[PDB]
Design a protein around this motif. Structure first.
Motif, mmCIF file in Angstrom:
data_model
loop_
_atom_site.group_PDB
_atom_site.id
_atom_site.type_symbol
_atom_site.label_atom_id
_atom_site.label_comp_id
_atom_site.label_asym_id
_atom_site.label_seq_id
_atom_site.Cartn_x
_atom_site.Cartn_y
_atom_site.Cartn_z
ATOM 1 N N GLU A 222 7.393 13.955 64.230
ATOM 2 C CA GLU A 222 8.503 13.445 65.081
ATOM 3 C C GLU A 222 9.742 14.771 64.370
ATOM 4 O O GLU A 222 10.869 13.414 63.200
ATOM 5 C CB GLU A 222 8.801 12.200 65.428
ATOM 6 C CG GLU A 222 7.788 12.056 66.567
ATOM 7 C CD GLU A 222 7.322 12.180 67.608
ATOM 8 O OE1 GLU A 222 5.965 11.779 68.344
ATOM 9 O OE2 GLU A 222 7.740 13.458 67.803
ATOM 10 N N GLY B 298 12.045 17.882 67.846
ATOM 11 C CA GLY B 298 11.100 17.614 68.735
ATOM 12 C C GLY B 298 10.051 17.168 67.870
ATOM 13 O O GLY B 298 9.686 16.741 66.905
ATOM 14 N N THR C 263 14.411 13.760 66.669
ATOM 15 C CA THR C 263 13.755 14.791 67.416
ATOM 16 C C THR C 263 14.699 14.515 69.140
ATOM 17 O O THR C 263 14.756 15.113 69.154
ATOM 18 C CB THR C 263 12.394 13.595 67.636
ATOM 19 O OG1 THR C 263 12.380 12.633 68.454
ATOM 20 C CG2 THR C 263 11.533 13.560 66.314
ATOM 21 N N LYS D 203 6.428 23.373 65.325
ATOM 22 C CA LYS D 203 7.400 22.489 65.106
ATOM 23 C C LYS D 203 7.583 22.862 67.241
ATOM 24 O O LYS D 203 8.359 24.501 67.589
ATOM 25 C CB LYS D 203 8.843 23.033 64.920
ATOM 26 C CG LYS D 203 10.331 22.080 64.970
ATOM 27 C CD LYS D 203 11.029 22.275 64.172
ATOM 28 C CE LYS D 203 12.403 20.546 64.141
ATOM 29 N NZ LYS D 203 13.245 21.350 63.457
#
Ligand SMILES: Cc1ccccc1C(=O)c1sc(Nc2ccc(S(N)(=O)=O)cc2)nc1N
Length: 288
Positions: free
Chosen positions: A12, A16, A148, A33
Motif C-alpha cells: 500500500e 494507492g 494510501t 501504482k
C-alpha cells in the motif's frame, strides 16, 4: 489495467496500491501504482511530466502515466527488493560498511540530480529505496507538493524538524535530513528517531540533538508550531548516537542533521565529504 496481468500486490503505497505486473503484450515486468477521484488536479500533471523526464541511474524510471476511468496509474521499472526488507534481512550481521557507503553515495547522487532540477522527494524512507542484484540503489515513490487512504499509519521517523514545526515551504534540506536518518539506521540497525506521533517524533529528535534554540537555529522560536513550553533537553554526546561509525561518517551525519535547513549540508557538498574517499560499489547478497 486491461493491458496488465497483476502478479502480486507489493503493498500500500502513499496514494494507492502497488502491484508487480506484466505488460500482457510486451512481456515487460513493472511496478504499477494505482491511485483513487472526482476531478483530478492539473498542477500535479505538470509535476508528473517533469518526474517522467527526470531520468537518472539512481532514480526509479517512471515509464508511463495513464489517467483513465477516474483512476490514475503510474508504471515504473520494477526492482526486486526495498531497503527496508534488506535491512531486516541483514539485521543479525549488519550491512557491511562498504555497501552502506556505496548506497549512501548513490542516493546522494540521485538527490543532487533531482535537487539541481528543483525536484524534492519529501518522503524518503527505507521502503521507498529500491535495490537490485547489481549493487545499485534507487529513489522511488517521489511525493508531490500536491498513506494510501483509510486504515493506515504514516511513518514519521524520517521527517525533518522544520516540517514537524509547521514550516509551510519545504527546501531540498528535508531530503538530506531523511537520508541522514536512514544512514544512521543502516549503521546501528535501529531507527534513529522512532516517533509514534508528531510530538513524540519531535521530542525524540530534541532528546538526542538537544532542544533547538535561536543560537543553533535562527528563527526556530518563531515557527508555526513552536511552543516556549517545549522541554529543554541538552544535546547528547554524538559518539553515543551511531557507534561504532568512524569519525568521517559521524562528521558527515552531523552535517546532514543540522537543525537549521540553511546549515544542513547539500547533497552535492556531501558527495565531496572525506567519508567517500574510499567509496566502492560492492555486490549485495540478495535473496529473492
Ligand atoms: C510505486 C511505488 C510505491 C512505493 C514504493 C516503491 C514504489 C516503486 O516504484 C516500486 S516497488 C518495486 N518492487 C519491490 C519489490 C519487492 C519489494 S520487497 N518488500 O522488498 O519484497 C518491494 C518493492 N519496484 C518499484 N519500481
Amino acid at each position: 489495467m486491461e493491458n496488465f496481468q497483476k502478479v502480486e500486490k507489493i503493498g500500500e503505497g502513499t496514494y494507492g496500491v502497488v502491484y508487480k505486473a506484466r505488460n500482457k503484450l510486451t512481456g515487460e515486468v513493472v511496478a504499477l501504482k494505482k491511485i483513487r477521484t472526482e476531478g483530478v488536479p492539473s498542477t500535479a500533471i505538470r509535476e508528473i511530466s517533469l518526474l517522467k523526464e527526470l531520468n537518472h541511474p539512481n532514480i526509479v524510471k517512471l515509464l508511463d502515466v495513464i489517467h483513465t476511468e477516474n483512476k490514475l496509474y503510474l508504471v515504473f521499472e520494477f526492482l526486486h527488493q526495498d531497503l527496508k526488507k534488506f535491512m531486516d534481512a541483514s539485521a543479525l550481521t549488519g550491512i557491511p560498511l562498504p555497501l552502506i557507503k556505496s548506497y549512501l553515495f548513490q542516493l546522494l547522487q540521485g538527490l543532487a540530480f533531482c535537487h539541481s532540477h528543483r525536484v524534492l522527494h519529501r518522503d524518503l524512507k527505507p521502503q521507498n529505496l529500491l535495490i537490485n542484484t547489481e549493487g545499485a540503489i534507487k529513489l522511488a515513490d517521489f511525493g508531490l507538493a500536491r498513506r494510501t487512504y483509510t486504515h493506515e499509519v504514516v511513518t514519521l521517523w524520517y521527517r525533518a524538524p522544520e516540517i514537524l514545526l509547521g514550516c509551510k515551504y519545504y527546501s531540498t534540506a528535508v531530503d538530506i535530513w531523511s537520508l541522514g536518518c536512514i544512514f544512521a539506521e543502516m549503521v546501528t540497525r535501529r531507527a534513529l528517531f522512532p516517533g509514534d506521533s508528531e510530538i513524540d517524533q519531535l521530542f525524540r529528535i530534541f532528546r538526542t540533538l538537544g532542544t533547538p534554540d535561536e543560537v543553533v537555529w535562527p528563527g526556530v522560536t518563531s515557527m508555526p508550531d513552536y511552543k516556549p513550553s517545549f522541554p529543554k533537553w541538552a544535546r547528547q554526546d554524538f559518539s553515543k548516537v551511531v557507534p561504532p561509525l568512524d569519525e568521517d561518517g559521524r562528521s558527515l551525519l552531523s552535517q546532514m542533521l543540522h537543525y537549521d535547513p540553511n546549515k544542513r549540508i547539500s547533497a552535492k557538498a556531501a558527495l565531496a565529504h572525506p567519508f567517500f574517499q574510499d567509496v566502492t560499489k560492492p555486490v549485495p547478497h540478495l535473496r529473492l
